[PDB]
Design a binder for this molecule. Structure first.
Ligand SMILES: Nc1ncnc2c1ncn2[C@@H]1O[C@H](CO)[C@@H](O)[C@H]1O
Ligand SMILES: Nc1ncnc2c1ncn2[C@@H]1O[C@H](CO)[C@@H](O)[C@H]1O
Lengths: 256, 259
């Protein structure tokens, strides 16, 4: 990361280095590198900041998790490369189990990811190591879940997830929250709560909200998670990007 | 193995596979995978189809290439993984030479890219194997081109290209045509003709266009080229995206299977 701190693409470049090493540590899938670029472009368009529609979604999600009877947080190759410590934090803050859930499971991937998480907590409870259950509707390898993790969860957080799984989880009766910079992806459109923000900002922001809501009443929380409309939240994100586009055009370098 | 053709995201997933196989073959760099994703995001915004402003730029690019005296088509790692066959097809249909130009050049990636191309034509000549001419304004390892290729070219096609490189060629007096799904990238803004469409739809369509216009009159060809506005095209692309976002926001997208 040898670039002036004043570089406008400072952080973006920094995480791009992180995602590359992720694959270098053998935990980030190649498809994960591609998904990362999808994120980069939408983040650039959005403004690399947590927009209002996102703060809104995170509020409802934290409220929703606080009421969960068995909340679970899913971790994949990208999460492990970008926010390995922050995901352990969010999981402690919401008293939620941690499950390694990969679309493409392998003995190495799981081990490496569990190892990466154990670098910030060698004691934390990590599920999905030995997955016995299956998410209905998915190909055997892609629908693996842990008898004690997602399989029994009522509210689940699946960040940077493939649309088929999000949909399948909703179909099996799980309430699904996702973090996804692409508001037009199947997953973003299928989730009950869609947080359109970079996970590097969303995760510490939610750990914050969980503190700011730690002493909330089950009534206050029910009011929150009760007034949330994911549809209007998605439409606003789209409108935001549209307005962001109008201005990005009247700026930068032009040639004529 | 492959994606079930019935899967609605078939094409999207097919090409993700191809770019992945490309890196597996040593032609594509890891960062090429990330760049593929950036393209996909913009494709999500345009709606994953060829829009009229793109078709418009495509006809202009073909017209210009057919009128060119020393046309050259550049090939990089992402190009090699996604449209190796169509790249060769386009070059022949435009009677242009092919040159390998990479961001991270190594003897292995060049070879592997060369081999891939030859699998569709063991006969085609490939420039850029060991380029010796340096284009000023670029870092040492990023600006060497082939003396008999881009160095002497008048019209150059540089798809999925770095802005600095697109910008450098323009500065060397080359008429630059690019294919880039991001209408706001430096490359899209600096190129003379910007084709905002996915290269997997663009190259096949241009091949078809080169054959169709292979017999046009210089009068027609010069008219097409003469009356083409790249700025207007980029703005028309942006307007299409902005109206599409407007429409979708109004209709709503939550829980919709398709858009
Ligand atoms: N750093 C990130 N933060 C949040 N979402 C991301 C990030 N990188 C990639 N994604 C999302 O992952 C999705 C694909 O699984 C993409 O739609 C993209 O928006
Ligand atoms: N398949 C593709 N077709 C056209 N342009 C692409 C594709 N993939 C990536 N790009 C573009 O190439 C640039 C990165 O080299 C990005 O700005 C992106 O818009």
């Amino acid at each position: 990361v040898n670039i002036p701190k004043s570089h406008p693409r400072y952080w973006s470049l920094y995480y791009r280095e992180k995602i590359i090493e992720g694959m270098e540590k053998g935990m980030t899938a190649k498809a994960g590198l591609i998904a990362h670029g999808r994120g980069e472009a939408f983040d650039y368009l959005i403004g690399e900041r947590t927009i209002e529609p996102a703060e809104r979604a995170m509020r409802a999600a934290v409220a929703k998790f606080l009421l969960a009877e068995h909340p679970v947080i899913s971790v994949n190759g990208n999460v492990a490369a970008l926010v390995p410590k922050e995901t352990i934090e969010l999981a402690k803050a919401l008293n939620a189990k941690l499950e390694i859930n990969l679309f493409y499971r392998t003995e190495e991937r799981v081990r490496t990811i569990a190892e990466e998480l154990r670098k910030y907590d060698p004691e934390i409870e990590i599920l999905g190591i030995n997955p016995t259950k299956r998410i209905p509707g998915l190909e055997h390898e892609r629908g693996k879940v842990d008898e004690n993790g997602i399989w029994k969860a009522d509210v689940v957080l699946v960040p940077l997830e493939d649309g088929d799984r999000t949909e399948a989880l909703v179909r099996m009766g799980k309430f699904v929250v996702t973090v996804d910079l692409n508001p037009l992806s199947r997953s973003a459109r299928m989730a009950d709560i869609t947080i359109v923000d970079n996970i590097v900002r969303a995760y510490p922001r939610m750990v914050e909200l969980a503190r700011e809501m730690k002493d909330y009443s089950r009534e206050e929380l029910l009011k929150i998670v009760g007034e949330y409309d994911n549809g209007k939240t998605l439409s606003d994100v789209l409108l935001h990007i549209r307005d962001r586009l109008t201005r990005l055009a009247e700026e930068g370098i032009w040639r004529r």
